[PDB]
């Protein structure tokens, strides 16, 4: 079972970025998938999760209304559309997919997202 995140990089505060994650090696349509992040110096946190059918979602309080999770079961992919990004959203983002039985969850290797503050928006 393997997961690979696509997308990442630098965005100016207020901007948007879409992350994707594709899974291989088993059936994923019957289990939840999601995204965690580890901001500098912080504990890793569950950012968003989505049920097998897509009919239920979960968001961390600090991203509600700004991030949207969705999935394409035919591609075994999960997406994180990040809008209204803020510098506090700077983190390594890890996709995850659940399965029945130990080890219960697989994690991707992570992708860096960096959101620049206004101090960098002009030369001074």
Numbering used by the authors: 2 to 125
Task: Please give sentences taken from the publication describing this entry.
Herein, we employed yeast surface display of synthetic nanobodies to identify a protein ligand selective for BCL11A, a critical repressor of fetal globin gene transcription. BCL11A represses HbF expression through direct binding at the γ-globin promoters, eliciting the switch from fetal to adult hemoglobin (HbA, α2β2) expression during erythropoiesis. Although BCL11A is predicted to be largely unstructured, the protein contains several well-ordered regions, including a CCHC-type zinc finger domain (ZnF0) that might mediate self-association and six C2H2-type zinc finger domains (ZnF1, ZnF23, and ZnF456). Even fragments of single variable heavy chain domains, termed nanobodies (Nbs), retain antigen specificity and can be used as the POI ligand in a PROTAC.
With the aim of achieving specificity in ligands selected for BCL11A, we produced ZnF23 and an “extended” zinc finger domain (exZnF23), which includes the C-terminal unstructured region that diverges in sequence between the two paralogs. The extended protein fragment, which is 69.3% identical to BCL11B (the ZnF23 fragment is 93.2% identical), was expressed in Escherichia coli and purified, and the recombinant protein was used in a screen of yeast surface display to identify synthetic Nbs binders. An initial Nb hit (wt2D9) was produced in E. coli, and its affinity for BCL11A was assessed using a pull-down assay and MicroScale Thermophoresis (MST). Affinity maturation through random mutagenesis of wt2D9 was performed, after which 7 Nbs with better affinities were obtained. Of these, 2D9_V102G (hereafter referred to as 2D9) and 2D9_W108L were selected for additional studies because of their stability, high affinity, and specificity for exZnF23 of BCL11A. Size-exclusion chromatography coupled with multiangle light scattering revealed that BCL11A exZnF23 is monomeric and formed a stable complex with 2D9. A crystal of 2D9 complexed with exZnF23 of BCL11A was obtained, but insufficient electron density precluded modeling of BCL11A. Nonetheless, the high-resolution structure of 2D9 combined with maturation mutagenesis data suggested that some of the interaction with BCL11A is mediated through a loop in Complementarity Determining Region (CDR) 3 of the Nb. MST measurements demonstrated that appending ZF5.3 to 2D9 did not significantly alter the affinity of 2D9 for BCL11A exZnF23. However, neither promoted loss of BCL11B. Together, these data indicate that Nbs 2D9 and 2D9_W108L can distinguish BCL11A from BCL11B and target endogenous BCL11A with high specificity.
